[PDB]
């Protein structure tokens, strides 16, 4: 069922104009249509089981951004955000980037790291050679547990194990389970996983196992995108568009340079895929620590885009960073906004998510670089 | 008028009962107290003009931590997230740490960076030594549109330049404006003085003044805060008190050799901190992007937190991070419950929230570390 | 009252004959003027109560060097050292200086670093965030013994604290007070100060204070100069002046580049500061430490000057470094001939003369390219 994401007319619409359009579009029917017309859509006491000392909800504001296309399939954004210009700005440059036919995307693997710390071996390279010995033994005891995962075609891949053997703790050894969630954002369930192994751990080791967790640094989840302008979809009247090509280029240089600019420039960039992370249900601290804790892996906190003239002369985009999102979980389940957003998105799996969101971040980049651009 | 920001039996309460409770303490009126009962707090015509394409309001569970005691003054902390365990955690840690006295709190000014960009002049060192003789004169100009904020005790203090002389686009000059932004985030303030200053700086350089724009990475506006615990608080049916610090201490440890461990403590952190930010109206992208740069500014992405081990055997933990939240602008003036959470703190400097604001995070790492210190 | 600091014909002059131009331009009485033109300006006794174990006194050669313009005012530099060329080369650049307007120049404030050094303390970090909680009341403390000096202006502006955690005899925390010194030196006021708030710092941290003592590393208390030369000014009959541009650029990127090269740059610098540093009665030791240090803060031992090519073409030379030098205490009060060098100068603030100083630094630093430049 492909659809137009161009939203005609929307800044002159009332919302529930707005919803409308939408309900037509996305083919929701009357009921879904009235639980976004209506506050209150989470009954306080589904928000009493979710959250410790409820006293009620709050509230932000609730969006759809426009003409977004990914890999050639128009997609329907929601936003919940406070601040004025994100959702314009995304609307903008995703309309723009339709010319050279929108955003193109890929990700690596759903894969998660569970790190199970090990403290107190006095041969800390012996034991990691120990259990990389015994590595096929561990993964099979990661997957027992975890069935259904396993036959959904996910489940423990690989396990890694660095030493750290200089803390003023003592020697640590932390093995990494290296695990395909599938569509799950995945942490009970590598969490589980590490808690599954850690006695055998211990065993081979003769360690004590402490921590036993996931990593939010998810750099083996990667959501990636690309897109692209011309000269003449980008000229303004006071600027012919090689000018603002120009000047973008310019603009990121100074992130890839500053780190006092790139915090900027990467904010600007969570502007655009926080709100989809939380209209969503998704769990935007990690995101955000992942998408942070990412630009600064090369020893300098740095841009997480690009920008480029091609050969042909036209401003390309890309991006890349962690993506580790959801769609079975937590609030993604039990908010019924948050199932209606996906819905409204027509997404059918994490990866598909995290790419729409990674190239709203994308086009959120450009809005506020190409601004800077044109004053 | 002091309270007592302990939240007794808030676990077995219904959300009207803790209401009741919340509107005693803290003194609200009726409409107050109507106004969290009731779904919609947020007019769909105020959404409307907060954010573009409005179609409705996503709601958040809205939750009160209790306990916390800040400078000795005991503070309810409104806080918006959809993960259980938060709230608790930081209630648990927070009483915990009255024994010890709560937290100790401070900051260093209310101080926000706009960058000022320079580009294609050849001789930018010459340049930078220009800026910096007619320091005066800029800070003046930067000034002279902001007699309000100046009048206030705020305004342009200094300014410093940056030379990037070896970028792939030539050498760059930052000029930073060092500007005391008072009570308000402070974004529109430092863009229109860098805005102000622009053309002169163009004179006295030379050159062409490209981006005039706030740095998010708000080094210069840190909130700090440090608490204790003693072994016998600390004790556990299963644990000596002694065996909960020295496992802390270790997480910690591990977090601050580590990356990936890092990435997921500073998480951690900012499940504490974010939803404080979201209940008052503040921009959390913000927040996030200054924490996470901050925290590699060694060149290496470590840990937000310390916890150590006090002469007489006392765990003590602090924390330290940009803290760039209002009190005047934006959603926090605009979301009917964004100044209700304002009034259940009772906070009146943006200094004070962003204390409060720490020593949850403070707390809520805490939690993490204890929790998974305890199996 | 404006001199002009030309020399006319200086080289062909006796001494008597320079003294008696001198005291004529500057407004030398007869006995300023006798108290030069004959040895022993600084009686044997004077001299036994600055140093121990006197026996005599050592001359340095004395000279004035000629032509400097700093910010539109004319200046004669008095220097005292032993080597050939230094003078002559000094007036040389500072001759072809004035088609362009001559040195413009400009300071940070006078603020020097008082260290406070505390070991001994299990928690550090913690201790750091007690003394920053307390730091108003230290900075009163700092300025209590002060009134002189707070009255003049100056005093104890701020205080920070750096943490060296792994060291090998254990963790250390620094309290840097930063402290305004108006026309000092400053070093025994700082240490004064330093001593002053010692066992406060000992209550608050639960150390004990080593160290009381200033930082030569200056960083704070930077003087700069810039200057500029046209082509037409530094033609020869040998080299077109855009060819001696070309050429003194390039031997600056060499000190840029090799350490080797750089430690030569800077002693050159410093042949040019030095000499006015000695005849004003300032620790000459001092400033080379700062300046020397100042040139390896980037992790790269390097120049303190920079020279480019401005837009039009002409030579622009910049330098910023450390300058601790005052008017007040020490052997500049002590020293018949050093009152008498600052009266010369007519200068009247520490600042300004910092900032001579390094003007003759950049002059001397041209000087020695140029002629490495022109064979
Ligand atoms: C806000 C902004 C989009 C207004 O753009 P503008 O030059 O005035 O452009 P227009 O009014 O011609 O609108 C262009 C497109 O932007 C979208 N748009 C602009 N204003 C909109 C609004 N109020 N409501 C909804 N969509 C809007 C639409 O897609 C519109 O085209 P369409 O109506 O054909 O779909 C533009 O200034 C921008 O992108 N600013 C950057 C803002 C930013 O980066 N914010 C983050 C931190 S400040
Ligand atoms: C969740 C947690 C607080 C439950 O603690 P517990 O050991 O079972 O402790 P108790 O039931 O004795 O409660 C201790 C305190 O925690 C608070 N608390 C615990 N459960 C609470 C609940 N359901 N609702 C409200 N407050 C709760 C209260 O302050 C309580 O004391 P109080 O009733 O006297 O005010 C504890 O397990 C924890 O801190 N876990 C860490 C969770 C975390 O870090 N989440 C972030 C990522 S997973
Ligand atoms: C020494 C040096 C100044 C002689 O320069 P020169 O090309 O022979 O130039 P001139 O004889 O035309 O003199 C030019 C100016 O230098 C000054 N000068 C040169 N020789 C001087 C001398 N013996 N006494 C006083 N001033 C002298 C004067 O200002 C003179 O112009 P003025 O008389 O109009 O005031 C020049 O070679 C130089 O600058 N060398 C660099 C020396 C150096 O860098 N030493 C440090 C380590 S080696
Ligand atoms: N498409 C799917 N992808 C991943 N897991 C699934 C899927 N469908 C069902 N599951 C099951 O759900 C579990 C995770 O559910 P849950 O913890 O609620 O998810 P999340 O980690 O996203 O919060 C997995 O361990 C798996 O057994
Ligand atoms: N207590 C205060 N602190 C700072 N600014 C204030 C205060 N009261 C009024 N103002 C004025 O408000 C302006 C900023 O308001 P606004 O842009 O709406 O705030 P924000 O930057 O927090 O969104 C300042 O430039 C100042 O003139
Ligand atoms: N213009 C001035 N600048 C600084 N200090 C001054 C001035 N005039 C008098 N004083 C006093 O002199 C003191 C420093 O004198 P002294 O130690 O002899 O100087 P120095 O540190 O330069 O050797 C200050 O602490 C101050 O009280």
Same mark, same amino acid.
């Given at each position: 069922? +492909?659809?137009?994401?161009?939203?005609?007319?929307?800044?002159?619409? #009332?919302?529930?104009?707005?919803?409308?359009?939408?309900?037509?579009?996305?083919?929701?029917?009357?009921?879904?249509?009235?639980?976004?017309?209506?506050?209150?859509?989470? +009954?306080?006491?589904?928000?009493?089981?979710?959250?410790? @000392? =409820? /006293?009620?909800?709050?509230?932000? +504001?609730?969006?759809?951004?426009?003409?977004?296309?990914?890999?050639?399939?128009?997609?329907? =954004? $929601?936003?919940?955000?406070?601040?004025?210009? /994100? =959702?314009?700005?995304?609307?903008?440059?995703?309309?723009?980037?339709?010319?050279?036919?929108?955003?193109?995307?890929?990700?690596?693997?759903?894969?998660?790291?569970?790190?199970?710390?090990?403290?107190?071996?006095?041969?800390?390279?012996?034991?990691?050679?120990? /259990?990389?010995?015994?590595?096929?033994?561990?993964?099979?005891?990661?997957?027992?547990?975890?069935?259904?995962?396993?036959?959904?075609?996910?489940?423990?891949?690989?396990?890694?194990?660095?030493?750290?053997?200089?803390?003023?703790?003592?020697?640590?050894?932390?093995?990494?389970?290296?695990?395909?969630?599938?569509?799950?954002?995945?942490? @009970?369930?590598?969490?589980?996983?590490?808690?599954?192994?850690?006695?055998?751990?211990?065993?081979?080791?003769?360690?004590?196992?402490?921590?036993?967790?996931?990593?939010?640094? %998810?750099?083996?989840?990667?959501?990636?995108?690309?897109?692209?302008?011309?000269?003449?979809?980008?000229? #303004?009247?006071?600027?012919?568009?090689?000018?603002?090509?120009?000047?973008? /280029?310019?603009?990121?240089?100074?992130?890839?340079?500053?780190?006092?600019?790139? %915090?900027?420039?990467?904010?600007?960039?969570?502007?655009?895929?926080?709100?989809?992370?939380?209209?969503?249900?998704?769990?935007?601290?990690?995101?955000?620590?992942?998408?942070?804790?990412?630009?600064?892996?090369?020893?300098?906190? #740095?841009?997480?885009?690009?920008?480029?003239?091609?050969?042909?002369?036209?401003? =390309?985009?890309?991006?890349?960073? $962690?993506?580790?999102?959801?769609?079975?979980?937590?609030?993604?389940?039990?908010?019924?906004?948050?199932?209606?957003?996906?819905?409204?998105?027509?997404?059918?799996?994490?990866?598909?998510?995290?790419?729409?969101?990674?190239?709203?971040?994308?086009?959120?980049?450009?809005?506020?670089?190409?601004?800077?651009?044109?004053?």
């Amino acid at each position: 069922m +492909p659809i137009d994401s161009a939203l005609p007319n929307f800044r002159s619409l #009332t919302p529930e104009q707005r919803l409308s359009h939408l309900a037509r579009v996305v083919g929701l029917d009357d009921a879904e249509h009235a639980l976004l017309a209506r506050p209150g859509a989470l +009954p306080l006491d589904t928000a009493n089981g979710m959250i410790e @000392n =409820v /006293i009620g909800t709050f509230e932000l +504001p609730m969006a759809v951004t426009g003409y977004f296309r990914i890999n050639d399939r128009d997609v329907i =954004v $929601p936003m919940a955000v406070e601040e004025p210009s /994100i =959702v314009a700005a995304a609307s903008y440059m995703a309309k723009l980037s339709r010319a050279a036919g929108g955003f193109r995307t890929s990700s690596s693997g759903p894969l998660m790291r569970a790190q199970v710390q090990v403290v107190g071996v006095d041969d800390p390279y012996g034991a990691r050679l120990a /259990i990389l010995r015994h590595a096929a033994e561990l993964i099979a005891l990661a997957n027992s547990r975890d069935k259904v995962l396993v036959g959904l075609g996910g489940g423990c891949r690989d396990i890694e194990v660095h030493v750290f053997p200089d803390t003023p703790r003592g020697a640590m050894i932390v093995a990494h389970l290296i695990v395909d969630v599938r569509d799950a954002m995945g942490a @009970n369930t590598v969490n589980t996983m590490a808690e599954t192994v850690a006695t055998r751990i211990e065993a081979i080791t003769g360690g004590q196992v402490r921590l036993r967790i996931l990593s939010n640094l %998810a750099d083996l989840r990667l959501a990636r995108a690309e897109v692209r302008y011309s000269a003449a979809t980008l000229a #303004t009247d006071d600027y012919a568009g090689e000018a603002v090509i120009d000047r973008v /280029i310019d603009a990121y240089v100074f992130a890839a340079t500053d780190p006092y600019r790139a %915090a900027t420039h990467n904010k600007g960039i969570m502007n655009g895929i926080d709100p989809v992370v939380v209209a969503t249900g998704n769990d935007w601290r990690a995101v955000e620590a992942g998408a942070h804790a990412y630009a600064s892996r090369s020893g300098r906190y #740095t841009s997480l885009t690009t920008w480029e003239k091609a050969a042909n002369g036209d401003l =390309v985009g890309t991006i890349e960073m $962690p993506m580790p999102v959801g769609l079975v979980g937590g609030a993604t389940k039990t908010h019924p906004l948050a199932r209606l957003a996906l819905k409204i998105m027509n997404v059918t799996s994490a990866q598909e998510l995290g790419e729409i969101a990674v190239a709203v971040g994308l086009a959120q980049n450009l809005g506020a670089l190409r601004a800077l651009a044109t004053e």
